[PDB]
């Protein structure tokens, strides 16, 4: 629904519904680099669990 | 109070697939084990310092 509005002329893309108003979707196609993130851990001594 | 009486022991260790095939005639349905699931992190109850 975060798209732009939809109206009857949808030519065949997918589409939702926002507070009673049908929109589009968007999706994410996401690429990855090395060294970009870390994950946080929050140890307790001794062992290493989450 | 003795450990002699006691009727049975749980030992839980980490392994890898080249331990099992060290000896293949003593263990079998290796074929089948979802090896990514049993990950030392998916299991709490097993302490260890692995990251």
Same mark, same amino acid.
């Given at each position: 629904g975060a798209g732009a509005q939809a109206t009857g002329?949808?030519?065949?893309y997918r589409t939702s519904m926002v507070s009673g108003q049908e929109h589009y979707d968007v999706y994410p196609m996401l690429v990855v680099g090395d060294d970009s993130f870390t994950s946080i851990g929050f140890q307790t001594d001794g062992k290493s669990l989450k | 109070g003795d450990i002699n009486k006691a009727m049975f022991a749980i030992v839980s260790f980490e392994t890898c697939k080249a331990d099992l095939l !060290?000896? !293949? #005639?003593?263990?079998?349905?290796?074929? !089948?084990? #979802?090896?990514? +699931? +049993?990950?030392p992190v998916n299991e709490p109850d097993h302490a260890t310092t692995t990251p």
């Open positions: 002329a949808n030519p065949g | !060290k000896e !293949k #005639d003593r263990y079998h349905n290796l074929n !089948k084990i #979802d090896w990514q +699931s +049993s990950a």
